[PDB]
Design a binder for this molecule. Sequence first.
Ligand SMILES: [Mn+2]
Ligand SMILES: [Mn+2]
Lengths: 363, 363
Amino acid sequence: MSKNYHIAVLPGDGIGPEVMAQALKVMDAVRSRFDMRITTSHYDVGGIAIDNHGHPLPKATVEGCEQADAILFGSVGGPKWENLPPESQPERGALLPLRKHFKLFSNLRPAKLYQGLEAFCPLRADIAANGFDILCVRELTGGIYFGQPKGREGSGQYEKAFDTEVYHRFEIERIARIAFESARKRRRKVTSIDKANVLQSSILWREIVNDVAKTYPDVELAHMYIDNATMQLIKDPSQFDVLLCSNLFGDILSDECAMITGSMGMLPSASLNEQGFGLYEPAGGSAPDIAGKNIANPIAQILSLALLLRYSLDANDAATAIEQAINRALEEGVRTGDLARGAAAVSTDEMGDIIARYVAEGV
Amino acid sequence: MSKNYHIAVLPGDGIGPEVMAQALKVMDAVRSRFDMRITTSHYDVGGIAIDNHGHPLPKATVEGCEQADAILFGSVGGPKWENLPPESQPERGALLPLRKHFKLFSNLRPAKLYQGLEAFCPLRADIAANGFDILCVRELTGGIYFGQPKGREGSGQYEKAFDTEVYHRFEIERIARIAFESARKRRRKVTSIDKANVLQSSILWREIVNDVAKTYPDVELAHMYIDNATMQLIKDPSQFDVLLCSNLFGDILSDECAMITGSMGMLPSASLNEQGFGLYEPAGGSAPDIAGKNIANPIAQILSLALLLRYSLDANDAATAIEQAINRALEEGVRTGDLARGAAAVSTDEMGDIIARYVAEGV
Ligand SMILES: [Mn+2]
Ligand SMILES: [Mn+2]
């Protein structure tokens, strides 16, 4: 008994279409198992949109997303457009405007080292064997990415350009809550990242996070400078549970968290507004190197469909089945090339066929 | 040459006087072997200045530095002064005003994995085995840490605090030239780090660095976004030669570079103004926990003397002789207790003995 949900599917560039095809395989297994009514439409975004429409975010694409319950997004960008004005580049001219337009203030990126994939972790084996499991909560619609004033002025030696790391109380209140709520579902520890020794905006950030913390006396709260956090994710990632970050600090540390897993092809991303509409994608980029070679790990994309089902379509049931289907395959020792490091790997397609199959197979 | 160089020596707190003694011991070996006239005057700074003068940056100290060709600086801080207001504590009250007073716009932090010390690198062994050797150049007196406007205003949920990432053409050019000139003496590669897909200040930064590059056509220039650079330093640090960074981005990445060596006791730091006057110090802090115990690694301080000789006293030969002596000591299995245990390590004053003699014996 379903509502006939709708998903705008934006595959994008590079490995985007390849891994998206696998997620739609899985989505079809979810439809015809959980008897959900799911309707989709495909739209161009990024470099493909630039190719067909001259713009990375077509109005028709934004309108398609508007008409949907959530956006399942691949990846955008590539060397074929890494030559355009920033305002005209696929990565920024699409993503930043989608975030602002749909008010997706909340970015959730879970990064854990999967047991038995320690070999691929780029950290020392003893650090890797200790393990880590982190959720990076990034503020997505404010701070320096969007702050005003922002521009360039003058000429000569005093020509200048400027951006403004500005936060309002409400912006820190709402992202801080997401962090603490997420912590309750995990290991009840939040580490808020700022630069409060110098930044006025960090001093307010720290203050408002301390105020929210009073609602969560069961959660251990720590504050840590961005420059220390960058070191500690290398030195001892096991110390973090939930990372709470600004837009810019989160951009840096969330990608650092992805790198230290050694398995970015398994990492999903959710960007959420207050109404529960979201944009769900792999944590990695379009990977033009292997694009079109049926090599790419579809797991990040499929896991982001799971987040979509859980957070946007009130279907934790289908979300958890998908995650289950992915652990079984990995239990069995199924690997794409990135986690076989080449030898004995399955293709994007078979990995996607297998996961879709295990979902519909119930177990 | 002219001779009669003068250095202001500011040992500071904790391990600072300890490791400074060994830098001064090596400096006498440099005096003899290179027939250099280097006179010193010592001054209180940090905790010891608070003890003796009531505040961390006495005027006699600043004047003594003004009267010198360079500043050889130890480290400052410790638990004895942690009960003071933050702004009154040794490092905040001393290091920042000195940089500002002396317009020390450039920060150079060399980070290499020494042969023999790979075991301490926190990256996976086969990554550590590849090695790396990086100089991070960090704009030190500008950007968001000092930019205006900066403040906090308003009330309720729309109360806001803000900092401004602002750079002028003159700031960008002078720090870019330092990086190009440094790369010319290394492996002729500058990677300028920015966020030009999003920031207006980064767009100007990238534009001006491209102009400056035209003056150094014998040095390769690449650009990389800050969030990629954080990942790449973990994935493959061997790819970098010279990093050219804003204050914020260089702050973060020089600490990450320091972390990936796994041995901070080896790491020196130079902070230079446009006249070649500089403050030279270890990358690491005052290590109160081992202070006075004659175990602190003096190699950071000694290599910061080597940088003082190279950048302020026109004494590259002397600098290179100190560096060679350290390579020699390491090759003979000589280690301090941060690099080995028990009888496989030597004390601070024995390491200094060994380094000074290898310099004296070099010629
Ligand atoms: Mn990013
Ligand atoms: Mn720092």
